[PDB]
Each structure stands twice: as C-alpha cells, then as structure tokens.
C-alpha cells in the first residue's frame, strides 16, 4: 500500500500535464485490482504489465476524464454503518465518484458494499 500511494501521485502529475501514457517501474498485485476498477467505470482506457523478475513494470493509458485519485493511509476499519460518513468527506457531489474498500468479497465501491451488507478497510477514491 506504499505502492498504491506512489501510483496515485504519478497519475495526478500526468493528468495535469496532458500526457496520454504513463510508465512506472513497479507493479504489485493490489495495485492492479485498483486499476481494474477504474477501467470498468470508464475512467481509463486500459493498461498492461511486464514480467522481468524485478519489481515489475506497468503502463497506463489515460483518457481525459479523471479529476483526481487518492489513497488513504492508514487503512482504517469501517463498519457498514460508517460507510456513508467517509463518502461525504471525500467526494465533491452526491452524483459521481467512487470510494473503494477491501471487503471479504473482493474490492467493491461504496454502492455495492451497501447492497451486500459488509464493511472492510478503506483503500482510496477517485472522481
């Protein structure tokens, strides 16, 4: 989760400069679960990663649609009744944005966690 926060600062830097692609010289397993949840929601075009028997590599394809992404350290523990307070602190409006949690069913955003009756540890957000 030190690799998750490093990735979000490098994405904010390129999305502000108008880049199309981003190459990072590292790649972890839960860094790739966070990126697969931005792809199915429409915020990036795609990505791909290389195997080199070093720390890994990853290439992100940006879109033009991202306003910001972040990570929360440390990963607090939130019951299913406390999901909704973390949403009013992190997203600008009530109609868009996604807060992601690491639950006992995988990685879900805050709309799914309410339709499955679970809580977990917070990872990050993006809008």
């Amino acid at each position: 989760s030190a690799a998750l926060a490093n990735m979000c600062k490098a994405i904010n830097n390129a999305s502000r400069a108008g880049k199309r692609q981003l190459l990072l010289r590292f790649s972890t397993e839960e860094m790739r679960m966070f990126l697969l949840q931005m792809l199915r929601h429409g915020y990036i075009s795609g990505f791909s990663y290389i195997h080199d028997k070093r720390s890994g590599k990853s290439i992100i394809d940006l879109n033009g649609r991202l306003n910001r992404c972040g990570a929360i350290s440390p990963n607090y523990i939130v019951k299913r009744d406390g999901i909704e307070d973390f949403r009013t602190r992190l997203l600008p409006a009530r109609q868009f944005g996604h807060v992601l949690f690491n639950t006992s069913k995988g990685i879900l955003d805050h709309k799914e966690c309410l339709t499955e009756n679970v809580g977990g540890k917070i990872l990050g957000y993006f809008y």
């Binding site: 440390p74 990963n75 607090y76 523990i77």
Partner: protein, 137 residues
C-alpha cells in the same frame, strides 16, 4: 500514525497541551494559590485610608481610591471608587463590598495598579445613591 500506534499519540499530545497557559493552571492545580480573594466573586472589607492616584499618561486626571482590609483573610488591597463626587459618602472605619473589574485580572484603562472596584457602602448600592434612588447610610 500507523493503525496500532495510539499509545504514542496520547503520550505526545498531552505534553504539547501544557504549553497553553490557561490549561496549565488547571492541570497542575495552582489556579487559586496566589489570589487575594480566592474563589469568591465579591468580598467585604473595612476602610483604612483614602488616597488619590494619578492617571497613566497621555491622560491628565486623579482617580479616587481607598486602602482597605479584607475581613476574610487579612490581606491589604486598594480599590477604585467609581462615580462623580462619590468618595465623600464613605468615611474611615466604614465597611465596603468590592468586586472585580472584568478583564481576567488585569487593570483597565488608565488606572495603574488597581484591580478592584467598590460596589456598596454599608449595605447600600453605590450606583443607587448616585442616581437618587436610595439615601446615604
């Protein structure tokens, strides 16, 4: 600030709080040690002398005060007699009730060194004698 670090944060933030002066008098239990009337809001006293004090410049004046004796603790204090021509109702060996000024234990205005204020004179309000509602003692 890890998730298992709450004993390091209570230890650290309690020590920073002592740098606040108002909090430090309460936490160490020494808020009423050096105080001429302790925990009372008003106090009685008997009048020894009747003096006049200069205003602090740039103001020209002479403010009328009295030297008293606190009946409860035997400490000497000076107090200020507010209104116009009102220092002449009191005599010596009179009893008087004094109270604060209202600014946390500092002096107010151009009056140097005085932290108290005469309120009554032998159980009669001093402000009512000046407006004509009551009669002098």
């Amino acid at each position: 600030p890890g998730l298992f670090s709450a004993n390091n944060l209570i230890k650290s933030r309690k020590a920073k709080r002592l740098a606040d002066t108002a909090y430090r008098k309460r936490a160490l239990g020494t808020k009423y040690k050096h105080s001429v009337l302790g925990r009372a809001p008003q106090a009685k006293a008997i009048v020894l002398e009747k003096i006049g004090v200069e205003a602090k410049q740039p103001n020209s004046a002479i403010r009328k005060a009295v030297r008293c004796q606190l009946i409860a603790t035997g400490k000497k204090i000076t107090a200020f007699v507010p209104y116009d021509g009102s220092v002449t109702y009191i005599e010596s060996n009179d009893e008087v009730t004094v109270e604060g000024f209202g600014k946390k234990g500092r002096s107010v205005g151009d009056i140097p060194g005085i932290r108290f204020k005469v309120c009554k004179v032998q159980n009669v309000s001093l402000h009512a004698i000046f407006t004509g509602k009551k009669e002098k003692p």
